[PDB]
Design a protein around this ligand. Structure first.
Ligand SMILES: Nc1nc2c(ncn2[C@@H]2O[C@H](COP(=O)(O)OP(=O)(O)OP(=O)(O)O)[C@@H](O)[C@H]2O)c(=O)[nH]1
Ligand SMILES: [Mg+2]
Length: 718
């Protein structure tokens, strides 16, 4: 439909805890915009915002939705996040793409922990925040109570903008303070009455109006003659002052609304359209190369694609935000990655579900295209002159993982296909195929996240899968040096296959001086360094073959045979464990036969000698250790330290700040297969953690003995 200038386009992302009456409020905006006819109810599951089958099946939103609402010369790009704790990826994508964040407060519950999580996310992403109160129709609500709760929760920089009078089911009016008005509605709701406030609330109205204008002046001093001295500049420049304060997060406004009764949603529309940071008036995004990318109509034609909703019967719709320039139907756009020079077609502006075709899209706006071929999530499409490969969006580390497998080992290709399709659906569904582990790894954000994926596989497509606990990457090694001796000769086949290998194994460190004397078994030996070569391992670790050939006792021409034997024994551990690392090998004695010396003899000799050397040496198992950064309030510091102590953890350091204390610990992955669920249960979901690999380390005797016993228990079947 009608094209809008970038100066009249705003991007808004709603944020709030579950059970906050937000998605409904979205239907309130859709109904009052006139784009839809009736105002549906989430109970009836007829809401336009909820169309994914799981989204109405669960009774709450699962994916973030994008939609447009039109008003007087202003159109708002409303993005409704799922609002749950385990759908962080949609929220962070919305924050990265949007311009401003909105927080909705439930009057019944007041400030909730999900509100804290969303506030932390937007603080990390540095976006403006406006507070809002929902559910004023519930008796279990007190505007003063939530006001003081938020006063004592965050800084004094915040300030309310409206003063509701009635409460609970009897709510039929409220007072606007920014514009100095009182609003009332019919019991049906929808038509505000701009009748002025009575003199009863005149005193408090003036008090909080003076407080608000003083706060706005402190946000930015406009130097106008009466601005901070006498009174505010009515309301016209108050919007600009509020926006400027929101630029630096110097003030967070507070609003109230009733979703069911539609109390003053028009007031919200007017306020949001009036005051909000502009698309250009915000800290501009950089590119991968670090060159500034200022959104402008006169700029080149580049597009970035983030959302790839694949809801059935509506097509593989792919949204996108216009980074710079414009876009027209029929244009040919280059693809930054796996470039194919995609030729575009009829574009559509979608209000969620139903979409409306549009002719031209300006920079800094969200559009949607269909029937694409080589466009995936995170891929960006650009013109010929504008080489951009935008990768400015970062997602939180996968806090949970599980191994997937269908009920029948006959649809592996279907697993790959649909799992990839879901990957694009939300990049958080990190899919990985560990070739060494022979398992397909799925990384999510929690138990409920994987439950959601399981439902989408089972019901949306009628596909059967199971979840199994992922395998653990174990690496073996040695600690005690030992002497390995072997002699080989086989006349049963062809040549004599003569072989004689004598070698010593030793754990390798970064700077050992490799001493030349080793008194083992009442026998000392002398080692002479002639050729030093280090061969690294692709699975990590290093191997060294400092030779000790006695003045040419064994020809170096056969050394690759010993090396091939060594790695052929090495790639399989003598016990359970994929490989071994940090092993220093010294070979001293050997014999050479003019006709019976051959490479296969040294193959077998090295293999068996190294196997029996590991048998003689002390085998040890190394468990991967992942650093954990728990961000938890002090009320559960004892519980978390006790749980970690029960999780064979090593305390590193406790950080102190505000009310949440950061924790550092070295923790084995073996007991972290379900750590996120336990942490969420203990802290009520009030804490998060970050995982990252550090260094393999040793394990106690009991766990390795159990692992070995299970290894032969499994092997006994074959
Ligand atoms: N009593 C009452 N309840 C409301 C009102 N508005 C919303 N709700 C409640 O809000 C619930 C739906 O929550 P949503 O609006 O979808 O917000 P959410 O918690 O983030 O859920 P999703 O966005 O769908 O994930 C409904 O079951 C209603 O009970 C209202 O005006 N009055
Ligand atoms: Mg909602």
């Amino acid at each position: 439909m009608k094209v809008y200038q970038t100066n009249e386009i705003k991007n808004i992302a709603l944020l709030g805890s579950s059970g906050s009456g937000k998605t409904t409020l979205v239907e309130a905006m859709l109904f009052e915009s006139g784009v839809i006819k009736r105002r549906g109810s989430v109970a009836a599951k007829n809401t336009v915002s909820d169309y994914f089958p799981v989204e109405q099946e669960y009774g709450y939103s699962v994916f973030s939705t994008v939609l447009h609402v039109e008003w007087n010369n202003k159109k708002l790009n409303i993005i409704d996040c799922p609002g749950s704790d385990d759908f962080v990826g949609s929220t962070v994508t919305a924050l990265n793409v949007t311009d401003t964040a909105i927080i909705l407060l439930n009057g019944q519950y007041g400030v909730e922990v999900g509100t804290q999580n969303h506030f932390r996310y937007t603080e990390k992403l540095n976006k403006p925040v406006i507070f809002l109160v929902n559910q004023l129709d519930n008796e279990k609500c007190d505007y003063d109570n939530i006001l003081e709760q938020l006063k004592e929760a965050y800084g004094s920089k915040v300030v309310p903008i409206q003063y509701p009078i009635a409460t609970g089911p009897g709510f039929n009016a409220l007072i606007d303070v920014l514009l100095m008005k009182k609003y009332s509605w019919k019991p049906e709701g929808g038509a505000p009455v701009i009748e002025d406030i009575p003199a009863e609330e005149m005193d408090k109205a003036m008090e909080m109006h003076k407080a608000l204008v003083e706060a706005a002046a402190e946000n930015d001093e406009g130097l106008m003659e009466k601005f901070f001295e006498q009174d505010s500049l009515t309301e016209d420049e108050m919007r600009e002052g509020i926006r400027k304060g929101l630029i630096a997060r110097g003030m967070f406004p507070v609003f109230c609304v009733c979703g069911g009764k539609d109390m003053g949603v028009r007031r919200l529309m007017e306020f949001l359209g009036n005051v909000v940071p502009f698309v250009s008036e915000m800290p501009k995004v950089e590119n991968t190369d670090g060159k500034e990318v200022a959104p402008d109509v006169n700029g080149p034609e580049s597009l970035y694609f983030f959302k790839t909703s694949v809801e059935p019967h509506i097509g593989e719709v792919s949204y996108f935000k216009v980074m710079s320039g414009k876009v027209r139907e029929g244009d040919d756009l280059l693809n930054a990655d796996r470039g194919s020079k995609e030729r575009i077609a009829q574009i559509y502006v979608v209000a969620g579900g139903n979409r409306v075709k549009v002719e031209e899209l300006q920079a800094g706006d969200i559009g949607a295209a269909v029937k694409l071929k080589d466009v995936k999530t995170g891929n960006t499409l650009n013109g010929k002159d504008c080489d951009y490969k935008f990768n400015f969006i970062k997602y939180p580390n996968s806090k949970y993982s599980r191994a997937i497998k269908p009920v029948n080992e006959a649809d592996v290709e279907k697993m790959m296909t649909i799992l990839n399709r879901m990957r694009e659906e939300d990049p958080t569904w990190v899919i990985e195929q560990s070739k060494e582990l022979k398992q397909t790894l799925v990384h999510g954000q929690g138990e409920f996240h994987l439950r959601t994926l399981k439902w989408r596989l089972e019901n949306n497509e009628k596909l059967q899968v199971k979840f199994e606990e992922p395998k653990i990457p174990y690496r073996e090694t040695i600690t005690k040096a030992a002497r390995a001796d072997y002699r080989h000769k086989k006349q049963s086949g062809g040549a004599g296959q003569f072989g004689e290998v004598h070698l010593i194994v030793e754990p390798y460190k970064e700077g050992m001086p490799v001493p030349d004397t080793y008194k083992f078994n009442g026998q000392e030996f002398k080692i002479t360094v002639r050729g030093t070569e280090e061969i690294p391992l692709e699975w990590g670790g290093k191997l060294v073959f400092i030779n000790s050939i006695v003045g040419g006792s064994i020809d170096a021409r056969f050394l690759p045979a010993i090396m091939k034997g060594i790695m052929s024994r090495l790639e399989q551990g003598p016990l359970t464990g994929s490989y071994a690392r940090d092993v220093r090998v010294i070979v001293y004695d050997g014999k050479m036969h003019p006709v019976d010396s051959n490479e296969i003899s040294f193959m077998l000799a090295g293999r068996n000698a190294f196997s029996e050397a590991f048998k003689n040496a002390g085998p040890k198992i190394l468990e991967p250790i992942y650093d954990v950064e728990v961000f938890v309030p002090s009320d559960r510091m004892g519980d978390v330290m006790g749980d970690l102590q029960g999780r064979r953890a090593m305390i590193m350091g406790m950080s102190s700040e505000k009310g949440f204390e950061k924790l550092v610990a070295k923790v084995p992955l073996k007991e972290m297969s379900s750590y996120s669920t336990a942490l969420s249960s203990l802290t009520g979901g009030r804490a998060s953690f970050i995982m990252k690999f550090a260094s393999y380390e040793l394990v106690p005797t009991d766990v390795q003995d159990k692992l070995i016993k299970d290894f032969e228990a499994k092997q006994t079947e074959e």
